[model samples]
Target chain A: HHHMATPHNSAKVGDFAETVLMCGDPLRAKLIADNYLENAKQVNSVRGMLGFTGTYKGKPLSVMGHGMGIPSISIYAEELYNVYKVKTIIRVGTCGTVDPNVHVRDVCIVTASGTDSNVNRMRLLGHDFPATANFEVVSALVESAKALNIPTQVGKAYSTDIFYSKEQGLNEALAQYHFIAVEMESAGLFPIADYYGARAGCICTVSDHIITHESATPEERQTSFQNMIKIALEATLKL
Target chain B: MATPHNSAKVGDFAETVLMCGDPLRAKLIADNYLENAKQVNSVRGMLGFTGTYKGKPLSVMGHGMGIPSISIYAEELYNVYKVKTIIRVGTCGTVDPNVHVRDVCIVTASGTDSNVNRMRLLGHDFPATANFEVVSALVESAKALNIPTQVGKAYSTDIFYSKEQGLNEALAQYHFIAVEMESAGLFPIADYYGARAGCICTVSDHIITHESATPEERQTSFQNMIKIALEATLKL
Candidate 1:
């Protein structure tokens, strides 16, 4: 028997498309649905985490918001895969680059993620969990970005629980380990996808550079968001 | 600035304190163990009390659950309250086959699923070890009280309801004798904040045998733990 409505998602089993594009903000989900999808229908609005099902490029797709942090994103990702049977989820969000070489406004295709969140370790029973994104989804995102003439950097990210980290030299320390960017959700998302045998990936725009203290203007942020969403949607075509 | 989570004034707490995960346990310790005890803080229903134990000033409080919850209280106690030492008295399920229900576990170190310790150590392992002075005092108290105890590493978890399969087997392989939440979080904060900290847990349940201590038996055992903890802090 298919799982019924969860406490968070009121969407029925078949309400969601196989491929779902995710954002951290509900408003961004709405924006994606309004600007990109054709014949879009609001599937769920539980907890103000918006979800929409529609067709993109004449192919059925869905977009939803996962909220902030590992705990919030893990709940949504687990439900989307296990309950709704969603196959693919591509998280489009913003991150601060830990590396000085990676500047604001650049796009990052996260190939692997490290996290301060315990979800991955919990899943693996107190071991060091390697949360790697799906190879298929990574290729699809890279190919789509190339086709659209959008420059993207593929690298690892550190998904931290603390937004205002008090640790001295946190960015420099993570950069030493080759973590190109610091964000909040990708590390939580990739592990769940592996557990459910569903594909998942993250494409984040560099909203700020932590080392250089350079940030994108609000107008420039929206442009980067658009670029990320477009790459996520176009990647769905390949899947 | 006054700390947001604790309602107690700067002088309300003692230099040495005992912590439990449950607020009710904190109330119980104050009511049953301490002399002329007074409730110091009740912020977020995490109770705190201060009084004299064996003619020595002492305090007791609830740390709440998990890493995020305990870190807040520990940081405040160490920084704002000027608390020098903390001993966590709690319960855990036994993961090692050699351990059983109702046994006292003196945690010397902890391995955890949470990354709080890592964050404090520049994203590397922090070696969440209990302060030697606290550990020695605990061991000394258990011996003087003739309380048979198991001293070893504990696997501190974030989730009470775990989804991982073969959890016990994994923990046992890693030589983790007990499984509980908070110690891994507690030890690191004590290190970072420059306070001595230790944890002593009673085996309330067995993850391997699926045997659990009944409420009546647990009450008796918990009181024993509390007595040992109280006696231990006097030496500190």
Candidate 2:
């Protein structure tokens, strides 16, 4: 039994499907598998970043948890795509709102991601790399949500590294730059997909608002907006 | 027998210096050295770059050919601080012809560079990193030459990475932006010295214009601009 150390799961090739739903929280991965997956099997359990493969409505799929940051999730997504041949990854995560119009529990489909990460530098030489969701993925998600009559907004999200730092008017500047939400890992993930010639998309629920200091409680997050998850899964099944 | 890569004698450092990245190309450095200093010392052979140009009492230092993509030599200039001024006499392989080959124009300083290279990402992050004194010196040189010049535009120069493909769009979107190249390393060096640093570029040709010159034609570059560089160096 040859085992791996970091990613932990030892699912053989072809065990996992090309479409993956990624969350940052391992518990969330487990919860999605338990509640939504029809024939769910644990794939990897390394670093407590759980991965599971299962069928949703007879469509084969997988869910994996990628921890914080561009660097962390980049390794996970790279291994999955390059090693296992996973073609499309959709990230489901939480974000803090930068736009005043955005409120807690609002679903956001990331149209473009603006980042200050070296990942792009490593990708595109020294130019400003713009991370965008695949048009087909974005169209499918939006169409599925519309078919389900669910509310959603699409705009730019800022992917940042620092969680806390004293910087003057940085948020103000970002807001002026039209960043609707801020998250940590999508910018990194999007480029990795682009590098590997795969498709990546992100759908985030606004968990906190920087301007309003409003946030969702744990219980609120648990029960709120299974619609986004459902829409992502349905979009996956459609693809 | 103990020396960092530069093996020049103690007196080899000149008050004025003209530096380019390539050591074999230091022939221009030698020619400038003759005008500014009395003797020349072939310092480090680390990669066929770096030497000294000595004249009268002044010594013109030459740091050999540098990394094509990074500014390692500029870092060395600030670290040594033996010379009062460093003027970069280098050729720019650019994409625009508003400035043309063998057309010498002085750099007016650089715009603030912010990328993910550093750890700081917050508000208090220092922006607009450039040396004002160096810009003034170069501007004076450009004015004296009647070279057409523009100021306060940002050039995003990085190693040719695949991610940078989007820069072409960003460059086109922003008209204030012009003339991209490898001199970003020079900006930080001047800032570190509180001393002077500037670049007078003879557009080797145009990248956008798709115009270029032969190696023999490039050699004629110094004949056109040596007087301008010497005049600028002398004033400094």
Candidate 3:
């Protein structure tokens, strides 16, 4: 048997499902495992970044924590696709909305990610890489959101390295680009998925309204986050 | 009250500061070079010191690793402390074959994979070039000291262990001499805040080949690079 375990992941090659759902928080991954997956089994726990495989709607599904920042998410996503032979990755996380029309608690399905991280540039040889999501996975998510009667805003996201950006007019600038939300991981995941011939999509709940300074309370976030996760899980079956 | 990371009061820092990635190296530069050096900050184990070199005021601090880490410190240093200039004394991996281990590189311009500069420029390509006076001083100091140096562009990256295949070859083709992690973020913040910034790195390892400096050689070469940097700072 060929060895497949990397330093960060302890899971064997086939331990993961063909399609995996990823969140930035390990506790969130465990939460999804506990609440959504039936008969879930822990597949990875190295560095306390959790991974689990179980049945959702009688279909195999895997959920894992990707951690924060481009460097962190890129490592995990690359390993999942290249080593584990995973086919699809849907990042289910929270983002801050910069658009006036996008508000807190709104579910956003990212069609493309514009990033400040150079991973995509490195991939494309110092050129701007189009960090677009998989079309099929995105369509599946939109259809699932429709089926679940959950309203979703499908648009682009600006995946930034800094959450506490001090740059002047960032919100206005990104809004001009029509970015619906701001997150940290999708810009990284999208390019890696494209490079490795795998599929990737990102769905996020708007937890913070950057322009209005509005935010979801912990309880509100806990409740509202379900719609995005449900949409992600429901979409997984469609794929 | 002090800033969240630094406990140093305002005016504790000099007008110009030298930053290194490792806090311990900052201590080394202060202990060995500065006279009457005072330890001003140790918050988060990122050490900072202020003292005199050649009877002139100078400060040295650790900026930690990568763009995000350096950007925070540089921001506070410029906006809060009112520091006017920053010169990054660091180490890099050689991307171009001509840039060898133990050679010093005075970074004229930097290109990054981090979004710090892009955000500042409002999604446009902000040229991450260093202060011209600082680069001139560094180059003159190197020449005066009879030290051979490489002066060119550097690729400041977010990923240290880059997974991109042929990235080094790509960077080389783009005329990048070396690859480091901080200057891309440092240059822009300085520009935004009306300050000056420059970077000088010692090539510790060669990415094109297996050539690398031994620990002993690295220390000696680093000292030589610092000599040029210290002499260069005096020109400012």
Candidate 4:
């Protein structure tokens, strides 16, 4: 008895070129496509997840939605690398604030991710697995954001599985470890990408702050952050 | 939305339950037809799995296989006051062939379980859980086996998860203290039960003289020892 695996959005094994832009929302992917791509074509729509391929400054590129969480995004990233022959995935998303120094609308380039997920357990037993972005990607994103005159922080971020639970000193511990922000998906995604020999990077704008309870309004988060988006788009186009 | 769960049989739970033989196999409650009671249940099959069984008297027990590893079992016994439920559960199993000081002998009692299992990496956690009925059962079983025995020099081995890369030397440094420190951490509950609490020491025939040992010899070194240990360990 064979089982039919679900297909991903217009993401043909070869249609999704090496350089890809990944977001968590399908609509976000479409928005990027409509706004940035020269001639984009929808490649797949298997599970409401969307994908497209076009040109940015004539450089062939693809944009796809990675959904949410480490496990969810990991599946897409893994398939893109192993099956689709993708080489680089740049994740653009919004993240919650963990540092008192970080503010809404500030861009944060993730250097390393610390997480509680068991995805790295099989590899590094009894030690914290550091999910790090590729050095080249990190340098490129930082340079591109700087070129756009966007203020950004580059440091460690916390990735957790639980939306709500008695974490019991976890926040304090992570703070002690110098994590600049907290999110859910990057820790697992970065390590999995590294394991599969793929270059991965994450660029997130602070959407909410845990320290001061400050947050960006939905409008500001979605459409107003042109500076941050331009930097990501410019970086993707350059690569 | 819902899932089906596994169930067990009747009279399957014994008040005095022996455990820690196998980490994988669960105790199957024996089948018995009863008029007033009928229910079967199971727990999540994880490392911290749990279950219950009904018998002449209902016994709720979990098999925590192995030592230092047995802290989970000891916690269940002391915290739950499992002493009130059954008479005995022996640590009975085969013996090794090389250690022939006393063949067909019974272990009087365990000396010490490794401390590494209880010490968390953060250094804030420590658990001490052991039942007195377990000790008494060992004594009773030894008497029944009619084997000559020694009262001391047994070790509660710890092999749950090995940190082979690091801490091997640190563990070796603490072995001496662990070797001579007679049971100091296990809670005292069986004494209150007026239950016979003792250990039947055993001497298996297997002996390994070299520092470097064969995989087969290392695996079966304690087999015969456990057999005699079980002979005097089981609940009679």
Deviation of model 2 at A194, angstroms: 0.9
**Per-residue lDDT value at B40 in model 2:** 41
lDDT of 2 by residue, B1-236 (tens): 21354554443555556665555445545554454434444555422223332223333444543323334545554555355566666665444324456555444322223352232224221111223334445555556766545333334354333254454443333221234344445544443444455555555655456678667657766554454565565566
What's the lDDT for residue B138 in model 1?
82
DockQ values per model = 0.03, 0.02, 0.03, 0.01
Which docking band does candidate 2 fall into? Answer: incorrect
Ranking by TM-score: 1, 3, 2, 4
Best model per lDDT? 3
Instruction: Return the number of clashes found in candidate 2.
Output: 28
DockQ of 1: 0.03
Q: What is the lDDT of residue B56 in candidate 1?
A: 96
lDDT of candidate model 2 versus the reference: 0.61
iRMS per model in Å: 11.9, 12.7, 12.3, 19.4
Tens-digit lDDT track for model 1 on A71-181?
A: 999999999999999999999999998765688999998866767677756654566444656656877898899899999877667788899888787666666444566
- Give the CAPRI rating of model 3: incorrect
Pairs of residues clashing in candidate 1: none
lDDT, candidate 1, equals 0.82
Instruction: Write the residue-wise lDDT of candidate 3 on A1-239 in tens digits.
Output: 24438878989889999999999999999999999999789999889999999999999999999999889999999999989999999999999988867889999988667777767666547643446676568778988998999888876678889978887887776664456879888888876775566789999998899888999999879867888888999999999
Candidate 2 ranges with C-alpha deviation above 4 Å: A1-8, B1-236
After superposition on all C-alphas, the RMSD of every candidate to the true structure, in Å, is 17.6, 17.7, 18.0, 22.7
TM-score of chain B of each: 0.97, 0.68, 0.98, 0.41
Single out the weakest 10-residue window by summed lDDT for candidate 2 chain A. Answer: A1-10
Cα lDDT tens digits, model 3, B23-62, are: 9999999999999899999999999999998998999999
